[PDB]
Amino acid sequence: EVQLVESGGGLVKPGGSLRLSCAASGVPFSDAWMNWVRQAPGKGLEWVGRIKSKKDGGTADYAAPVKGRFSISRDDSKKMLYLHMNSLKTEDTAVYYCTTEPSGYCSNGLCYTGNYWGQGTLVTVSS
Amino acid sequence: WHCDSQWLGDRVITTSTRTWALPTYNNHLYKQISNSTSGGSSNDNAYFGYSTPWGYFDFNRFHCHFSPRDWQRLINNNWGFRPKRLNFKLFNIQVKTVQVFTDSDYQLPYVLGSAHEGCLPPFPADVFMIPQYGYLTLNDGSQAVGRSSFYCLEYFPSQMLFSYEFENVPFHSSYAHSQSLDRLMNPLIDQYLYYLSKTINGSGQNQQTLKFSVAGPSNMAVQGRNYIPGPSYRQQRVSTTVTQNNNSEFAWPGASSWALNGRNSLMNPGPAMASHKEGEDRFFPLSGSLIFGKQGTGRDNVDADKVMITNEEEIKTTNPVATESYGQVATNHQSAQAQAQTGWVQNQGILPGMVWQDRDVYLQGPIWAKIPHTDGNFHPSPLMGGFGMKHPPPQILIKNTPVPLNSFITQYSTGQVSVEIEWELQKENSKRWNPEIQYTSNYYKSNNVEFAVNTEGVYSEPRPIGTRYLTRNL
Amino acid sequence: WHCDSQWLGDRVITTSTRTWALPTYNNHLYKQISNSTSGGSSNDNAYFGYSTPWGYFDFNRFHCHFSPRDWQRLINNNWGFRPKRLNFKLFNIQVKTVQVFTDSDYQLPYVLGSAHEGCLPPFPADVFMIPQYGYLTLNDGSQAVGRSSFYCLEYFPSQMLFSYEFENVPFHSSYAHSQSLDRLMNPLIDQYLYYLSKTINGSGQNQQTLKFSVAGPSNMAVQGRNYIPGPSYRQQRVSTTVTQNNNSEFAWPGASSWALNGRNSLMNPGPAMASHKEGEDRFFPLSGSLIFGKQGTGRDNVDADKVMITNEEEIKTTNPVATESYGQVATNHQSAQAQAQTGWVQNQGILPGMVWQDRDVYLQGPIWAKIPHTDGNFHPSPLMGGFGMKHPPPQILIKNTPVPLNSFITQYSTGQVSVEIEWELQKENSKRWNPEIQYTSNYYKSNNVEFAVNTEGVYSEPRPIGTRYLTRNL
Amino acid sequence: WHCDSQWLGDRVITTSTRTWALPTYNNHLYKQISNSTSGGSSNDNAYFGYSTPWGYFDFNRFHCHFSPRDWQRLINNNWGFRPKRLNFKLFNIQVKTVQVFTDSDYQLPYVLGSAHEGCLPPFPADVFMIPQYGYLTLNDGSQAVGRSSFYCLEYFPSQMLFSYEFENVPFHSSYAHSQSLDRLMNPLIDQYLYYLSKTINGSGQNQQTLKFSVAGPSNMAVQGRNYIPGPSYRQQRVSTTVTQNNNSEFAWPGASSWALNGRNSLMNPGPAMASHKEGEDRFFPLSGSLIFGKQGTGRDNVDADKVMITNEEEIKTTNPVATESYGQVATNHQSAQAQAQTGWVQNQGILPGMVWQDRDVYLQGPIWAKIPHTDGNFHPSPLMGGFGMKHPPPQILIKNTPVPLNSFITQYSTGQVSVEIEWELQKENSKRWNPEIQYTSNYYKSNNVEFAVNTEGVYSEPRPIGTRYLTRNL
Amino acid sequence: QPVLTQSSSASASLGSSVKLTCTLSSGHITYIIAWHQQQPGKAPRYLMKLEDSGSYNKGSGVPDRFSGSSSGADRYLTISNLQFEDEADYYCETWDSYTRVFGGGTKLT
């Protein structure tokens, strides 16, 4: 059973920086691609970025709005996914979900065809 | 000069006589070769070996011994075939002495099972050059190790100027099942075995239940079966229509490989598996199919119409598809807290009760291979097709005897080579009512006749011809 | 009439005579059938084939040849058995001519290995109906392909109104090991081999140390072993207490399957694996058992107590549990910067040095299956149990001759059938001191007698009887 | 007294005589033993069994039958060996009667295949103590089950005070290949097969193409090959430089293991795989390599300089590295949407066309094992090395007859044992020009000669000696 | 970059089937898509993903009344039996190697 919890959400002034973290469970974190998506209150889902697995290279992809402001990091040893936020905007305030990559994740010659959303974390950017 | 084929009962005797030319290689020297002498940087491609002045005769491909009309006559009328005897001759020597010896103890390395060029040409009027002999031994990078070997071929006694008995091997199976592994059942009758049809009554809380049902014609996927399809090692799927393919380079990065002593090697062709699902002919495994070139095709970066890609779709009855997963397995214990979880098997080894078909042989493809000499092996039949043998037809080495000290006279030889193989046949016993599929030429008119010369006199083979046409029951 | 069992030394002869009734099928027509004729749209359930007016005789289940007391006599006193010869007779034809022939070249599809209903009844007084013959061939969806075969059984010579010798097969093993694969050791003595006991001295930085201990009686998990258990392909674990099952429909979604040519077939019953861990009797593998219905059990969605679920737990000595992972492997290289990571091996194929037990045969279950005709197979012993054979007992086809053109006389036939099989036995040599487990009846009073008639004269078999009671060493 | 080795042609005859002492075990009692009696709380370590007053003779290790020179003479000059006959003698009985019987029907549990201590000493002047016979049986926890067996060895007829024919086994291959599995090719010639060199023309959009190239000497990784390396089950990699290992306990947590009936046994030594890559000998698999121990070492938590870790590197030509993945399999279908992906394969079972070498045998290591009696096995050769046998050298059980009822006289016996084995040999036919690698002593001076007593009279064997020196072609 | 279009909101009465359209951009036609439901107060739930062929892989924890099918460049989701328990935003997503795109949501009532 795969479980994904997020943390690091709270109040930050419009100028400033914050880190979010996602600690994966029940999934082979080393072999899987991860994703961040955010949902503005009363609005639909919006994708943020992904982090590819070590085998495929540690490169990360970013959505056009958040490009260059945010970074995604991963700690394979600690099985945690990170989102570093810098230069915030009022519009940024959303519930940030930690989701595994939709295609799937294949570990040790076995593939898994289904997707697991995180619990979600509310981030209110205000002063 | 003997070239012909004698069709007698259950046997075939195919004689072939060719003219050859033997140059002087390496200026009569045994020269060390490695990737350094070539300049190769990469680690996977590192090698160490020696190049020898000797040549060798390679008759190891089918189109050496079979004409297209003999090959059609074989594959349409017969279920199985295999070699019995071998008779080799070398005559009409013309030197412009010549040493020759067979290696009947297999004391040299065996380079014939590697599918190299240099065969006796398919068309008898051709003259062929004799390829150079060389062998690789152990290496670390481009360096050797103490365990590496050096073989002087002058240290073998040779005749200055034979018959062979093939060891017992199974018939190559020329046929394609008229049943599938999963449909072997009687369509009219129910089984007496039950399967679990329903785990819940309906939408709601605490609805768990167990309901069992008879497996029968109505639902055939759940019936119990006595056998399962062959093993799988998945291949990537490439498309001949290039607009499905990804706009990225995945030729080496995306290919299935195996690693030995730190060096990766592409898995080619690999375990025998169907090439594509029924209805999809545009896909082929990345390294899972034998690819032959058309006549006159260049060496480097040819397009997809210059090569002939063979496909195994005949064996899709008993074998998994190369580009698909073998199946699903359960990855967890369910409970009220935990839902059922399954994973898709990418590679599956041998399990008891599997069945499979080996890879097909082609007019252009290899006949035999040598089984490596080892403590163990499983299903030694070679992966490129043909007949695996612990004692295959021996290597035949030949060179010009040097006439003079580095100063020698430029000298070459030529002659005739007649090779004769006795092939055993297995007749088609089928009671099938309706007519078989056959191999046919097409009556529709064309500029040239297939399997014949053009206006410049160049013999060419239009398409790869497989061996499996007639059908059997599974 | 011949029914009895001659028990002679190491041999058994089981004779069974029954009465049959043969109707007229398809009004003397061959008919093309497929899923489109029935109407099931699913792609996994797609089929194509033909139905024939012919019927056939199926004695392939054990309870045809064995009374319950002859079975109890077989399994309690004997370690192994296997069929040797067969004698078949068909007499007392009563038509209210009759064609019959046997297929001794195996030129027809073979439907007798799929565990279909239609056997000679277990109870000698039951008049039974012969099943209809039909077969499936290749298909694409519901359509045929150019490679599909059609067989007219009129085109086989028949006799209008024999003995068969079983090919050599291994003794079926009726016994359960008194040892387990990992406990084969001497409990009193140490090994001379060392294992790695400690990778660190204590809690703190830079504590890396390397310490080796002796494997022995105290710690048995780490000892070296010459053999490892057989292969596994994991099944989902289902509970017979329904409130421990998940509240969702996972019959098909959470099941282990294999895919062939794009059709997913349930993996049933699958490789031989222990049904459940020691002490847990309520869990069975989802698709990984044989499930027999009780007398009168309905066809569709019957409850859990209408059926009989067999358990393989006798083989938990050499075989992995069906619902468990085979083991663990390492997924990385440790270093100062990375901890040791491992993962579960859900499905494992054959490795050298494995040992395993095949699946048990039951009084209800099948006797033999036909090994497919293929280039290769591994451990051909069939997955539902019994004896695998490349030339099994042939199919015996029978029909009524049409007497008149679509206008015919309504007509049927009846008569007697006596099959006689010689069985070879393997005696129990054990030096075990304490008494064996035997298969016995319960003495406590019941309204009915088990394996006997009720007040309506309807014979019933209360439970499946396995073959494994006596013990051997591993 | 007979000790000497007869070297005659193609065979050897080795003879060993030792003096022994036989005590009185369990005060002439049979006693039930389990982990409850032992005190272990773990399930993986749980067991149930019996200890007996009997002893037994174990000659199952090589150094019993071979001096260090006879081993040097064997392994340098021979390509293979295997036992033929055995002649066990027991004489010069001295008591302070004696029962002896051999178990030739294999009706007792067989404990000689578990690599226990208690062998005849390597140095002929030592006097050894006969180990106590005990066995294990089925258990639920520490409790027994109704299927457990009890064996009274008194119920076997014994002689109050023989010769054996080894069943046919393959020659153990005492050689190392001078070629590697991937390098079998002719380095000088192109193949006629093509591979997919490129999938895109250049950087940009919509660049897809299929470009094919010839597999040849320049790129050897992509060539077609008939055979693939043997199976793999990955082990964790430990370094003998302790700072390179991770700072945490991972000996048991990170180890490769298999599970049987819910009990986890370490995978030791496991499949035959090369210990380490070329150039890295500081790494060794966690449970992969047979670890011996130096003389006078100690039982628990010894350092690394107190053990002898054997390496299998000679088989790195045909076998995958134990600490590396087998290879990569394509894990999806590429398309315009998704990039091609591949995944590491940790464990790979048998595929058709695999070849492998078995594990080497050492002067100190075991000779034979007993193949379990089961319905199936694959490549029964044992995993600790040596010769697998269904009916191996019988167990020879010995005890002192009691002289008195629990009151007895304290008493022991002693005497002589001689065992003589005939070994068939396979001579080296190699045509290699340059000299072989040999097993040789080092000239450089030292305080003590190797494989010899010291000033206190303690014999010791300094290093493990493998059997693989001479080379063959692959 | 693909563009996912879908209806703004659609409702159905209990016990009946509702169908929901998700339209792929042109030239992205062949892409595989996945469906998610989000309860009004909860994190989204993966439903299934459907190919251009009409083949679909349903989730592990999902009822059998969900199914999907596709015409050219046009994707569907069919809720055959409507239970008051599922009415929620149904999002349609599609992914590419470079980026992942979501639909605007469809509120079911």
Author numbering:
A (entry chain H): 1 to 127
B (entry chain C), C (entry chain A), D (entry chain B): 228 to 323, 341 to 405, 413 to 655, 667 to 736
E (entry chain L): 1 to 109
Would you copy out the relevant sentences from the publication that reported this structure?
The AAV vectors are composed of non-enveloped T = 1 icosahedral capsids, consisting of 60 viral proteins (VP), and package single-stranded DNA transgene cassettes. The presence of pre-existing neutralizing antibodies in large portions of the human population poses a significant challenge for AAV-mediated gene therapy, primarily targeting the capsid leading to vector inactivation and loss of treatment efficacy. This study structurally characterizes the interactions of 21 human-derived neutralizing antibodies from three patients treated with the AAV9 vector, Zolgensma®, utilizing high-resolution cryo-electron microscopy. The antibodies bound to the 2-fold depression or the 3-fold protrusions do not conform to the icosahedral symmetry of the capsid, thus requiring localized reconstructions. These complex structures provide unprecedented details of the mAbs binding interfaces, with many antibodies inducing structural perturbations of the capsid upon binding.
In both cryo-EM maps, the capsid was well ordered. However, the density from the Fabs observed directly above the 3-fold symmetry axis was disorganized and could not be used to build atomic models. Consequently, the bound Fab does not conform to the symmetry of the capsid, and icosahedral averaging imposed during the 3D reconstruction blurred the density of the Fab.
